[model samples]
Target: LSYLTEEKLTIVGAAGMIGSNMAQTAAMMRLTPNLCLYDPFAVGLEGVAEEIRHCGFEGLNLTFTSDIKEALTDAKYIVSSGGTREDLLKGNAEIAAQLGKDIKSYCPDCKHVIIIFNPADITGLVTLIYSGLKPSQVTTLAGLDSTRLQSELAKHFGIKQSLVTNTRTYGGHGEQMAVFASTAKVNGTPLTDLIGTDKLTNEQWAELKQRVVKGGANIIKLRGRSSFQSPSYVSIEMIRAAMGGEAFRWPAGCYVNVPGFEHIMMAMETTITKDGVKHSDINQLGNEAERAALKESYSHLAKLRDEVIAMGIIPAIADW
Candidate 1:
């Protein structure tokens, strides 16, 4: 009952490239249970399931099924993907809503839910609403922004990426993302201090931080496609960390009740677990510049939410 060591962690779009890779990563983890893969299209669900089963991981239980109820029964976490587009807002919204309903019905006790759906800031909120999940129960995979930022910082300092820690990426996942540059550190030392103000000017640091903000699109331009490997890795890393392992804080978006705006999910510093998010610790420590940056980033996300709502896609839920 502590961590989900034997319970299932279902992947909704297990047939897709990203989903399949996530399946593989989860299977390799020593702490997870039967990965229930649910892909209604059945495109490559069986293949991915079979692939994970043969990965030499002992006691791994991999289930390939198209049944939603069956897949969600006793699931500890559900990693969502698919149906994420601006034009398909209504269509995907319906799908997400239905998925949320089923999750509520079949896995009402599920600990945490992680979404990778585009416009995730919206869909994540939709999931929270439709599923009747508490603000802390739902989360989105916006941590990818922070991971990307961590990698950029490591490269800039000529240090290994693993040494970069506590680089909190706040707000929405994409262009609206904000990095807590002044607080980011490497092995407990502030990055700026390690690099030295003389060696790496403030302007250079600002530019590198911007690069981290644009990291997602920058990769697409060079690779002709968005990243799948790094995202999959980050997803696995998040799940593992959340399962009562280390209780480390990381950059993640959670469904929270915004102060002045409606209840929408926004990226913040959080710790996840089988019992759901620990809390929003985004206000921990930062300089004035970093705080202002967070405020500005949130404005962009809030505006995007307003625009989407005005488009008549997201129905008025008087519950906020």
Candidate 2:
């Protein structure tokens, strides 16, 4: 594949479900031949390595280590799900900050970093600030929310998922996420046109939005555990874009330091290419109410960033 590169790629938290899956996916996609997997849990990390080795992929140079420095050394690309969602804020924030410092120490020139931990907006910003990486070099996995919106729209309209295009979920990746139906198209028809019609009523639209918001919880309810498979595959797609593969197909959680939305990391209409990641100015994208909902979601992310600052996990906004 022309997209395949010789550059070293690192997968952090490789002992965990998401990280292990990411390692395998990267190999399957042939994103890089030089792949490293790191996890503090040495035994589990070795087990994951053995499983991948058993796959017998040719020309793959796979390495597994518990040492963070070894994992990051000369790594050109990275995808991390080191911290689980259950930690909430302070715990994961500290872990993220330390990981950032380690990356700064070991692989300061790494092309891109994809963070898929909980409170991704905060952790992603924390990593970006502490690692001294440009906003273009770091992104988080908020794209899953947008993909969920796409899936729900497809199910509702009884169409193939690919027919539903331009699905967007802006703001935070949590409950405050803003699901924008305005941008969605069902078979070349604007979703808004069908919302109040017999096809999909206003109440049904509202319920569908809520379903997207609670999609993660719904997975847990149905499977008796938190989601791992979807997030793993989705996050891999993100880093693959960074590795000069296909461009990211949905909005990503990017650090927004632009005017009118400064010093916050949130989901936006973003493009991830070989050059780096950048977001579009979404001011004119959605309706007033949808825009306001996005604003509220941004405010929530900013508050989380401030909490991390207050806890001394990262420096103050002005310092950055």
Candidate 3:
């Protein structure tokens, strides 16, 4: 799939919602994938395969292989969403952990993207550790972080809430997410001027931020389960870029290399090249108190990150 650069590739979980959606898109585009789809047992895929064929694609176009090693050998892009929530990060961790070794062994040049549920942060870390890949090669889709950033921007604007481009969400994916819209503006007007900091005080903005950071947890409470739409879809977006050999922008939750956030902070930004992330996105901060509030959010996540890594669920990523 490398040298030729045009041959279609594989989707490990072919029957699942995330995987199936990617497969359908690939097939519709007639990319000719050598689909090495593996689920514990195959039943529903019969219908999905038939649908693909009925849609003018062929079932034979897929390569049904039980070889996990062979399935990963020379495969470029690996899309994973392998299990339910009982053991969050447990299923995909085992799958991607083992696949990580194969990644290093056979598909060393292949670019892998992880889009899954459970401990997405930890699972993505494990996959990279297993594969011996650079941390940049591993990406976990934590959608709410970006949403929190946009939300902070809206709060800063105080105009019934909205989002602006050129804004970057950084720090940890969950509670410690740092939204830099304090320095953001709407329609060339500083967010502070537009939003009229009158009604929205610094503490109020911080409280709303806390809620946004906790968005996923709240969803699990309300729905009695997890959310798959935003994270899963974002992961697919990363895969699509690789599939077409087109490098695109991905706001990944990653580890930092710098201490002041420029060196070690990990995040998805507009990527124009294929190799790896260039640098962490560092947006300007608001006034003194606002900047302090932003730092407060980062510090909390830094502490949570320490606790999370203690689970041994993920490799020890630093907050330095």
Candidate 4:
């Protein structure tokens, strides 16, 4: 990684579309990576490596294998995606845990960037439960990216997505989610003020909120098997933040405790340093119901986090 004189990087699933896309983007950020891509299918990843090589990514250290130890050698930083077509999150966890073990063995100091779909809830949890890394080293992405895209789409009807931004979505990264969207905004203006009643009907907002919630599933249904563009993009955002050591950047530092969603889901410009998330000031939802809804979602998330832990996964919400 000549470009990153101070940092070394690796992508584990470089053969998939998301992995290739991540590699392409990672190269652009000027971080030449030592690619340790592993996919059972050889063609897709070979194509990805070729494309990366063609793009003059000289730091592209390529490897394709299923052996965890062989695949994760000397990796100080990792961006990963593992196959889970059959609802194999537990298997996925086992794989991630294995990778984490490898990380401790060959590259004990490595920091991980998990690239699974809705990984904000899984990868690193398994890794921490199964490996020796500190909980804060692994970060998984939640619903922020899809929620952001959904927020963008909501603007088409002239209501703007800010009405939905100020809330937090909790629970599973899949179709099941609790979206708190009563306190959104538009260009620093309150969304409730503009579409508070007439345009911002509760029924319509519910549908819109569901729209954001199911955005990922919609793409997957449209594309047949799955989708990863947004996931890849957001995961890269995590990678970039980690690479830059942005104090306020909110990458899913591992072993999360899902606590008080006693707030909204808006992307506040916070200062994220290595000390963890120091949130920028946020306005809690205004209406009593809005606040209640968010708290309910928060509680649901905490409960789910506990359940996931009970289900043999790492307890992501134990801290909450």
Task: Give the top-scoring candidate (lDDT).
Answer: 2
* lDDT tens readout by residue for model 4, 1-320: 24652355677777787888877777776654455566556777678767777877555554556556666666656777654432565566557767666677877766544545334355555565555765545655664634553464366455555443444443344344444444445555555564546756667666666666666667778898566676676666666665553332432333433245421222222333333233333234345665565355446545544545676555434342
Worst 10 residues of 2 by lDDT: 84-93
TM-score of each: 0.87, 0.96, 0.69, 0.74
Regarding TM-score, does 2 or 3 come out ahead?
Answer: 2
Q: What is each predicted model's overall lDDT from 0 to 1?
A: 0.73, 0.88, 0.56, 0.55
Error of 4 at 294 (Å): 4.8
Show the colliding residue pairs in model 3. Answer: 100-131, 157-195, 251-268, 252-268, 256-264, 256-265, 257-263, 257-264, 258-263, 258-264
- Candidate 2 residue pairs in clash (backbone atoms < 3 Å): none
Better of 1 and 3 by lDDT: 1
The digit string of per-residue lDDT tens for model 3 on 1-320 reads 32224443666666666556656666554444455554444675555565666666643366544456666766777777664353443555566566667678777777655646445554565666667767656666654576555666565555444545444455556655556565455546654553437655677767766767777787789877666455555665655555554565646655444444432223445352356434433444334654565456556545544554565644655431
RMSD of each: 3.1, 1.7, 5.4, 5.1
Task: Give stretches of model 4 more than 4 Å off.
Answer: 1-6, 58-67, 84-87, 118-120, 143-146, 149-154, 158-171, 174-176, 245-254, 258-320
**Index of the highest-TM-score prediction:** 2
Report the lDDT tens digits of candidate 1 across residue range 1-320.
23347767888888888888888877766657677889887757878777777776767667888989898998977888755455676666667778789888999888777777777787787787777677777777777777777888788778889898777777776667766666678767887585547756778877876788678789899899888887777766777766655553666677656454345677776777646675554455477677677778777777666766676545664634
Q: How many residue pairs clash in each candidate?
A: 0, 0, 10, 25
